[PDB]
């Protein structure tokens, strides 16, 4: 058996083909087992509609999830990614840095 804690990165991207659109991303990497719970938050509340949830593995024991959706951030909103996994005794909340 192997278990590996996810690394979690939260960032925003503009697709170059539609630069006015803005996507909030949670990249959850190198975890095992694959069982996981991942939400994007807006001021502490789960975002219900996340349009993209892309899972892959490299080695049979290394998983990668890109969890992202279109958003419209304002300076006064707080965005984050919340991850639950067997390796995390408490849910891990990673805040979006506005400049990322």
Residue numbers in the entry: 0 to 99
Quote the study on this structure:
β2m is 99 residues in length (10.8 kDa) and has a seven-stranded β-sandwich immunoglobulin fold that is stabilized by a single disulphide bond linking Cys25 and Cys80 (31, 32). The protein forms the noncovalently bound light chain of the major histocompatibility complex class 1 (MHC 1) and is important for antigen presentation. Another example is β2m, in which aggregation of the wild-type (WT) protein is associated with the deposition of amyloid fibrils in the joints of patients undergoing long-term renal dialysis (dialysis-related amyloidosis [DRA]).
Interestingly, two of the most rapidly aggregating variants (D76N- and D76Q-β2m) share an amide sidechain. Together, these observations indicate that the sidechain chemistry at residue 76 plays a role in protein stability and aggregation, but the behavior of the variants cannot be rationalized by their crystal structures alone.
